[PDB]
Amino acid sequence: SLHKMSMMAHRVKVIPYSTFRLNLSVTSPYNADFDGDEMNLHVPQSEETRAELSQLCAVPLQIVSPQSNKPCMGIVQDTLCGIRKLTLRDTFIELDQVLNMLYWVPDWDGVIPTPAIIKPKPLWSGKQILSVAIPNGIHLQRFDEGTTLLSPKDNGMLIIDGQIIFGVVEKKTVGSSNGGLIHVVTREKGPQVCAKLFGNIQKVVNFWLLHNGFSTGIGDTIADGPTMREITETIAEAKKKVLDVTKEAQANLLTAKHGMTLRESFEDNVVRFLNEARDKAGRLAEVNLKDLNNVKQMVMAGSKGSFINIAQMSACVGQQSVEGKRIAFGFVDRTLPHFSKDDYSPESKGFVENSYLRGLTPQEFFFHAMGGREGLIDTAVKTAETGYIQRRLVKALEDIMVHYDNTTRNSLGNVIQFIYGEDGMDAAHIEKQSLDTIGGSDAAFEK
């Protein structure tokens, strides 16, 4: 139980199977998955305890975390991908599916919205149904890069009277963002309204995704011939640059950066060149990928994956490193018995050229194994040290309270802060805002 969101009060619903069932958006504060995790349940035994749990530890009352000043819950997993695909400009639904999707909304008033296109065939856009799920009275406006009132890239977001006008819905809108839809709904309406919005959005998106389909395959990580040729050319150019640097250094013509030896600067240059080559190859592979790619769709939605994963899976695996440095010489001036003495080539020092799809040679396989071992050891040590630090910090600040005179005092009564946060404001009721007076020029300010 790291934070206060690790234990919250729910409502009992009896189910005919022997397993705890909870909403998907609730797992994020709990930091739990469904791979074998077990979680405890406590039952109050009195009326006052029940009332305290209902009015203080309820799930809707913990949407906004006072730690990061951001919501701790949001749309995750395949729901994010479904909401991104549904809101796309080219997504159109027919009457038969629209009626079912409208009926799936628990609090639908009973009014069928007018379809966007009526003359050739009645078609409803996905944004219309998503806005139907969104309660009325919420106005959200976000402008991304190159976003205008007629944005052609469908970026940003603009909501008027609970109706989506333009912009794809992604992690920046219904996720754990600063000024996302969840935060605005929680601040404007009650927490129960936010919970109902969560439920309605999840239901409609899940139904649409079930009746549409989404998958992934091996072919999503395969690039065309010219892209692989370009990646190979980039890798060869980087290797040639590294070889030239090594040749220059071996002739004592290299100049060492101030405060560094002749070896540290050379190693830094080598690792910088290798990292730049890997980044360029990954960017080329990502650019080559089409909009119908499943991995690209997952990455753009933000539900799972990243650019580095796509790079390592399609173009090239990054250089394996130990504690930030390359593979050390385990033998006498050698990394493996299969190499030669005093070899400083990138391949011999732990640089992987192939990708996961292409397969790894035994040497880079061993280097990757060493990197994974280092990662596992780091996690094992870090969890213990962080647990001890957290216990000490909790024990050292367990008696600090805010009294009725707006002063922060400990158990002994000593004054630590004459006003909480130097402003006397609750953390969960603070939003990031910009001050126009400080910025701008004198002429603009006067005008």
Binding site: Y17, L95, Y103, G110
Partner: protein, 111 residues
């Protein structure tokens, strides 16, 4: 052990009925019908046949949970047309179509 019995998804128990109509106050001339022990087999057919009707302004069905074999059907019809009449007409049309299909299949298989 919390395994539900396998016969509870198609056998009517005690105290519950196959059909249950409750009026809907959200929209005029709208009712909600709850079916017990069937799901996803005849509900789609009923919804499609109701959508084929011209005096039905709304027809949808949903299953609240896969654990329980039940679904709710909502029908909204034009003024002067009882939703039960529309349901009866859809059932009769389905019966006639199924009988015609069976007769045609038997005739084709006979040769």
């Amino acid at each position: 052990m919390n395994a539900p019995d396998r016969f509870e998804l198609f056998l009517l128990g005690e105290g519950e009925s196959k059909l249950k109509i409750d009026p809907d106050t959200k929209a005029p001339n709208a009712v909600v019908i709850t079916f017990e022990k069937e799901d996803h087999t005849l509900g789609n057919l009923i919804r499609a046949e109701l959508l084929n009707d011209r005096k039905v302004l709304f027809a949808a069905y949903k299953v609240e949970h896969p654990f329980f074999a039940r679904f709710k059907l909502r029908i909204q019809t034009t003024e002067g047309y009882d939703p039960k009449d529309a349901l009866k007409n859809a059932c009769n049309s389905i019966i006639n179509k199924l009988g015609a299909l069976k007769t045609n299949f038997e005739t084709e298989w006979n040769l």
